[PDB]
Every structure is written in structure tokens, then in C-alpha cells.
RNA sequence: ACGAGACUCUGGCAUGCUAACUAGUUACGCGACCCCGGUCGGCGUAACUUCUUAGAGGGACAAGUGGCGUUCAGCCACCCGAGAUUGAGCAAUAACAGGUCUGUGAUGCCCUUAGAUGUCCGGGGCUGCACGCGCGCUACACUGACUGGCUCAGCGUGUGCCUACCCUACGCCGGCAGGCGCGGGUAACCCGUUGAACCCCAUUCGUGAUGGGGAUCGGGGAUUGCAAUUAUUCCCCAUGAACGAGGAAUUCCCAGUAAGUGCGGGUCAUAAGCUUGCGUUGAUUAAGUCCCUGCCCUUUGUACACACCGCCCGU
């Protein structure tokens, strides 16, 4: 429809990227706001084609890890769907906005590197990658040998990480790295 | 990387050497000229040398060559060294002779010559680059 | 204490041990005259923003 | 034995070397400045 | 002059080009049900090649634009597009006392030859088990297991001179593994429209060494074979072991790639935890450096030349 392309049954507009740095490397809006995460692909042909890929698709692809779950994109889009329906019942907010703030408040601003161990700044594209990767890994471990299902652990990760609630696997790994980077800055 | 081998270039150069006047700018028109003027048993090699024939053609209109010898560079070049000027810089009226080139011409038959102007001497015996 | 920003005006190659730190000429957003050179971890294209947690450190160039 | 070449293939191959480019020689072009009409019957 | 390249194969497209009862499609008569109309891989057929098969030609060149390049050689973008760096094969000079005399009726010499080291038959052995290593397969579960329901592949093979061992439809009987009639095919004709797995949809199971895991092990039934015990394989029921993501160390890998899940071929009387191919679902991270390990140039140093796994000093 020319009105608004609603993400299955979710919002496109009123999803602000409230950080003035990561506004380019967050695809949620206007030209990349689609009915599903699932795309043709072809974002891994060039260097900076991977940034324009929608984050629902980035978090979809990031969730299929550890051998047995490899190439199960139809399972992971369904995990995203369930964990998105859960957030609207538990929070009272558009899950895309809660996701946007979760990615932005998870990406580490500094890191350490062997030049000897010296602190450097972090690229905004690595901030988006590490934010997505740490959130999916926190959800992955949280639902291992547990009655709490993957969509329930994934939603609890993204609520705690949007809040900076400190119970997140992603926030605890982020606060560790920034402190350890500061140790030799 | 897309460097053409010597095989491509020394087939393209001699294609322009013989058939310069037939050629043009765009790749497609003179790919078809390369059909008859060159026996090529490879359509990738044909399009490679045709592509270079166009690139070598574009740079000919800017001026000089590697050594291709187009027949209208020769007209111009010959017109520059079949050159006849008017009364110029060996047919002078005043020659500025030196203080002691005067008295060396006085050693010869040309002592008091008609049309020389003895330059006043250059005081400050200073012609060497300073050391350092 | 402040947390400041800086936009990438020019890339200066790639340093580090394993070739991982991109050396970058960044421009501050308080003064658009004040430039420093910064080491960045992760993939950087020319004309994006970085978050500087200390705005004082200036890296060793080559 | 590297076989020698003929356009037929009586002595060896029929295709040349793929690297071989035989740029055939042109004739001596006669050109005027005076327009000639070549009408005959 | 060789090698690189050029080359050959393969992949991508072509509503344009050529042709098809051993490929189809569209329209049409007929047939079935259908609440004027839909579906039909139900029957038959006058056009056509969009799908299919394999032919011939085109098509793509850094060609157009913009920078940088003394600046030719070129490099990076962007448009246009089926592709703006597909994947293989082939592959020099000079070598290694690599491996093969168990591929050869290619093989010098040495040893045997009716006391066999020749040749076949009857049995055993390569599998033996206090241990130590390498390649693998299944897993440690809930992103899961079990039981139903739903919908799609692509590479190949086939009646063997020896040569039987093909591939298998359909219908009966058997819980099953299988058995029995009756066909089709030397194959774009039949298996076959190759109804493959995973995935998808619904059920139960509930963090428990549990319905995770299925080793070991007891009893019984057919098949192949002349013959199965040290169990050829396969079916059923019972038995229900370690293992809670694996120390030091360490391997492979940058796009339809890794990884998961199946299916062909070879081996094959019997037969895939192997190998070689094919499709399917389909990522993370990187566009870099010489820090490790190694490679190629140029200087440089050398007491090294079976060339650093070198040479060499003293008690």
C-alpha cells in the first residue's frame, strides 16, 4: 500500500535512531522497510553493502549459529516474529524502537589492540555488528538446557539491553571491554 | 587488474599503422574493422585488441605517438623542418662585441668593422657558485 | 567530563600488529577547525562519525 | 615434434596458434582531387 | 625461445536466431465432479517454441562519464546492463638416489625351480588386545526428540563376449526384513513427473542423565552364497554404557562460500561410518597487514657447498 509498508503487522515510522553517529549504519526506514526480514541476499558481494541490509534481516541471520541451526532462516524469522509479539505485550512500545535502542546502547565505543596493548576507538559499523552479535549470543546461551524458550530469552535480552538494566549478557560484555580498554588507554 | 599483454599491443599498433583512416572512437564500429584487416582466431583476443585500437586512437588526436607513424604527423613535422623564415637572427644589424673580442678581431682583418657595438666591461669578477 | 564526536575527513592507511587499526584524520564537531589523528578498530569508509571517550589522546602517525 | 601449419591440414593442424595474429597487407590506394565520373553505357 | 597470458571445458542470458509423438505449451472437441462459472500429471488434436533438449552466431572491451596518474602503463568510482575479478583443466628450466620391481607378457642383475620361492585344492590369518597416535561417524538435547499431516530436486547407472551379478513397475501374501506372479526398458520411450531428506504445520514430552545418547548384549525370521562360527548384511523384541560442549595443542575456510540435511557413481554374489560427484536451506566476519609460518625480487654479510638438520671452541 502507498500508506505504509507494515512489517507483517508492525510500524515503519516513529522509529527514531536517537544517536547522531549510527544513523547511516542502521537500516530500519524509508527505503529498506519491508514485509519480512528474508531478502534475496547479495549484501556480502562488496565491503559496505552489508550496512544497507535491514537489521531485522541482520538479527535474523545472526540467530542461526552452532552447527545444528546453520541455514534455518525459516526457523529464525519465526523466532524474531514470536520475540517481537512478546515485547509489545511486556513493554508497551514498537519492538523496532526497543531493538534500535538495544543495538545503540550495546555497541562498545572503545576497544584495546596489540600495536604494547593500546586502547583505540571503534568504527560505527563494528558497533552495530558487535551489538547484534552479543545480543544474539546472550539469547542463545540463556535458552540452553532451560524450559524458557528462545523467543522468551531473546525478548528478555532486548528489553534489559534497551533499558541498560545490567542483567544483559551484551551490556556485561560491553561494560567489561570498555573498562579493560580504559585500563590501558 | 586489466593490463593487455605485448601480443595485444603490437597487433593493435600495426592495425593503426596500416589502417588509421578507417578507424574511429567507439569500440563497436572498429571491432568490425578489426574483422577483415586482422585474422584473429579468438573473439576475446579480437575484442581485447579492438578495445586497445580505440584507446590508442583517442590519444592520437591529443598529439604525438610511441612510434606508430600516421601519415598526417609527417606532413606537419616536414612542414616544421622544410621551414623558410624571413631575414632573422643571423641577419642582424647590431652585434654587442666584448671589451677584448674587439682587440681579438683587431688581430684579424676585421679591426674597425662597420656594425659592432663594444659593450662596456662587466666589473665585479664574480661568476662562481658559492660553496656549501 | 564530556563524551565528544568526530567525522572522518581523510583515511591515512592501516597500522597495528596484524594490520587491524585504521589511522584516520578526524574533525571535531565543537570546532570545525580542530583536527586530530585517531586509531580506529573495525571497517571505516571516509565520511562517517566516531565517538571519542577521551578527546585528548592523539595517536602516533607514520 | 611441434607440427608445422597449413590452412588445409595436410602436414598438421588447420587452426593457427591462438596467439598468432596475421594482419593482412593492404594495396596502394590511388586517390584524386578532381571528381571522375565512371559512366560506361 | 619457454613459462604467465592467449587456449579448451563449464556457469550465467537470448520472448531474436534454428528445430522436435523419445520435450512440451497454448487454444479446441470430449469426459468427470462442480453452486453463468473453478480444478483435472483425465482422453484425443490445429498452431507455436515462453518452459525443455544442443546447435550456430552474437554478447564484454576498463567500453561511456568523473577523479588520480609528469605519463604513457594504469588505478578507484559511478551509469548502462545477464554478467564490470565465475569455477576448473593444461602448465617451464633445473632437481629430489622421494613412491611404485605388489599394474604390466616394461625391467638388468641376484636367488629359486620337482628339497618349490612354480601351480591349484582344504583350513586358518590379515579383525587377534595391558597400550600409544591419525582420518572419521553419532551425539551431549527444548533453536530439541517422538507421532501424524502437508510440498518441491539435480547430477548419474541398467539386462554386462568372459559376465550369471541389470534396473525395477503393477497386483496378491507376510508385523517386518522378504516371498510370488506378471510386465516395461539396451533407455529425453521404463523405473520416473526420480512424490529424497532438512525445512514448514499440528500433537505429546518438561531440565530429569528424561521419550537426550544407542554402544555392549540375550532370543528368534528371510536374503546372498558351495560355505557365515571369530556373529555378510537386513527386520522384530528385550538390554539402555560413557558423554553436561571437551586440557595443552590444533585444522579448514571469504559467496550460493562455510555449515546442516539428503541423493547418485566407484567398491559391490552380499555392501558406505570411505571416496568422487549433484542439488537443497543458507550464514558470521574481511576488502587488510607482514606480527607468527612460509614464498618471490634487490642490496648486504659469511670460516657454509652431503649448502644452518652447516661449520666449530675448550676443560
Cβ burial of A81 (10 Å; 0-12, 13-18, 19+) is middle
CA distances for A68 relative to A137, A147, D14, angstroms: 15, 19, 58
Helices (H) and strands (E) in chain B, counts: 6, 2
d(CA C9, CA B64): 40
Q: Tell me how far the alpha carbon of residue C23 is from its chain's centroid.
A: 7
Give the SS3 label for residue A154. Answer: helix
Closest C-alpha to B42, from B8, B10, B16 = B8
CB distance C39 to C58 below 8 Å: no
Which sign does the torsion angle of CA A65, A71, A77, A78 carry? Answer: negative
Q: Are D21 and B18 a contacting pair at CB < 8 A?
A: no
The number of C-alpha atoms within 13 Å of D35 and in the hemisphere containing its C-beta is 2
- Contact partners for chain D, using 3 or more CB pairs closer than 8 A, are B
Question: Of residues 30 to 59 in chain A, which lie within 7 A of strand E by their beta carbon?
Answer: 38, 40-41, 43-47, 50, 53, 58
Give the SS3 label for residue C24. Answer: strand
- Distance from CA(A68) to C1'(E261), angstroms, rounded: 10
Measured between beta carbons, which residues in chain D are less than 8 angstroms from residue B37?
Answer: 23-24, 26
CATH tag for C1-62 (out of 2.160.10.10, 2.30.40.10, 3.40.640.10, 2.40.50.140)? 2.40.50.140
d(CA A153, CA A24): 29
Q: Which three cell numbers stand for residue A146?
A: 532451560
Domains of chain C, by residue range, sit at: 1-62
Residue for grid cell 539469547: A139
A72 CB closer than 7 A to any strand E atom: yes
The number of C-alpha atoms within 13 Å of A3 and in the hemisphere containing its C-beta is 4
d(CA D15, CA D6): 8
Method: cryo-EM
Distance from CA of D24 to the nearest CA of B (A): 6
| Residue A145 DSSP symbol | T
Q: For residue A138, what are the contacts with CB-CB under 8 A and spacing of at least 6?
A: A153, A157, A161, A168, A169, A170
Q: Best residue in D7, D14, D15, D23 to probe B by mutation, most B CBs within 10 Å?
A: D23
Query: Does C49 contact chain A (CB < 8 Å)?
Result: yes
d(CA A181, CA A173): 12
CATH number given to A6-183: 1.10.455.10
CB distance C46 to C13 below 8 Å: no
Closest C-alpha to B46, from D5, D26, D19, D17 = D19
CA distances for A158 relative to A99, A135, C43, D36, angstroms: 6, 7, 25, 90
Largest CA distance in chain A: 57
Query: Which residues sit opposite B97 in a β-bridge?
Result: B118
In B1-132 the beta strands, taken as DSSP E runs, fall at: 95-97, 116-118
CB distance B56 to B68 below 8 Å: yes
Measured between beta carbons, which residues in chain B are less than 8 angstroms from residue D24?
Answer: 36-39
Distance from CA of A179 to the nearest CA of C (A): 11
- Distance from CA(A159) to C1'(E209), angstroms, rounded: 34
d(CA C61, CA B7): 45
| Resolution attained, angstroms | 3.2
- Contact partners for chain A, using 3 or more CB pairs closer than 8 A, are C
Amino acid at each position: 500500500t502507498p500508506d505504509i509498508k507494515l512489517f507483517g503487522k508492525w510500524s515503519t515510522d516513529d522509529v527514531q535512531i536517537n544517536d547522531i553517529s549510527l544513523q547511516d549504519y542502521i537500516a530500519v526506514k524509508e527505503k529498506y522497510a519491508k514485509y519480512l526480514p528474508h531478502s534475496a541476499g547479495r549484501y556480502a558481494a562488496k565491503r559496505f553493502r552489508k550496512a544497507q541490509c535491514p537489521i531485522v534481516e541482520r538479527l535474523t541471520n545472526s540467530m542461526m549459529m552452532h552447527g545444528r541451526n546453520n541455514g534455518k532462516k525459516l526457523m529464525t524469522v519465526r523466532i524474531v516474529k514470536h520475540a517481537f509479539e512478546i515485547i509489545h505485550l511486556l513493554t508497551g512500545e514498537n519492538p523496532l524502537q526497543v531493538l534500535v535502542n538495544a543495538i545503540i546502547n550495546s555497541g562498545p565505543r572503545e576497544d584495546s589492540t596489540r600495536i604494547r596493548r593500546q586502547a583505540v576507538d571503534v568504527s560505527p559499523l563494528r558497533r552495530v555488528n558487535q551489538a547484534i552479535w552479543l545480543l544474539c549470543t546472550g539469547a542463545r546461551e540463556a535458552a540452553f538446557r532451560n524450559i524458557k524458550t528462545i523467543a522468551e530469552c531473546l525478548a528478555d535480552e532486548l528489553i534489559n539491553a534497551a533499558k541498560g538494566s545490567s542483567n544483559s549478557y551484551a551490556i556485561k560484555k560491553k561494560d567489561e571491554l570498555e573498562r579493560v580498554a580504559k585500563s590501558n588507554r | 587488474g586489466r593490463v593487455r599483454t605485448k601480443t595485444v599491443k603490437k597487433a593493435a599498433r600495426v592495425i593503426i599503422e596500416k589502417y588509421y583512416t578507417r578507424l574511429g572512437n567507439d569500440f563497436h564500429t572498429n571491432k568490425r574493422v578489426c574483422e577483415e584487416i586482422a585474422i584473429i582466431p579468438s573473439k576475446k583476443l579480437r575484442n581485447k585488441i579492438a578495445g586497445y585500437v580505440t584507446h590508442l586512437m583517442k590519444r592520437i588526436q591529443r598529439g604525438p605517438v610511441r612510434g606508430i607513424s600516421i601519415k598526417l604527423q609527417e606532413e606537419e613535422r616536414e612542414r616544421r623542418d622544410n621551414y623558410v623564415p624571413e631575414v632573422s637572427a643571423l641577419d642582424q644589424e647590431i652585434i654587442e662585441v666584448d671589451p677584448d673580442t674587439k682587440e681579438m678581431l683587431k688581430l684579424l682583418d676585421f679591426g674597425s668593422l662597420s656594425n659592432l657595438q663594444v659593450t662596456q666591461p662587466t666589473v665585479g669578477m664574480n661568476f662562481k657558485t658559492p660553496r656549501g | 567530563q564530556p563524551i565528544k564526536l568526530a567525522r572522518v575527513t581523510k583515511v591515512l592507511g592501516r597500522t597495528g600488529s596484524q594490520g587491524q587499526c585504521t589511522q584516520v584524520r578526524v574533525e571535531f564537531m565543537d570546532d570545525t577547525s580542530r583536527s586530530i589523528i585517531r586509531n580506529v578498530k573495525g571497517p571505516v569508509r571516509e565520511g562517517d562519525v566516531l565517538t571519542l571517550l577521551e578527546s585528548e589522546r592523539e595517536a602516533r602517525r607514520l | 615434434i611441434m607440427l608445422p601449419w597449413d590452412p588445409s591440414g595436410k602436414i598438421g593442424p588447420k587452426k593457427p596458434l591462438p596467439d598468432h595474429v596475421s594482419i593482412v597487407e593492404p594495396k596502394d590506394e590511388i586517390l584524386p582531387t578532381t571528381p571522375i565520373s565512371e559512366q560506361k553505357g
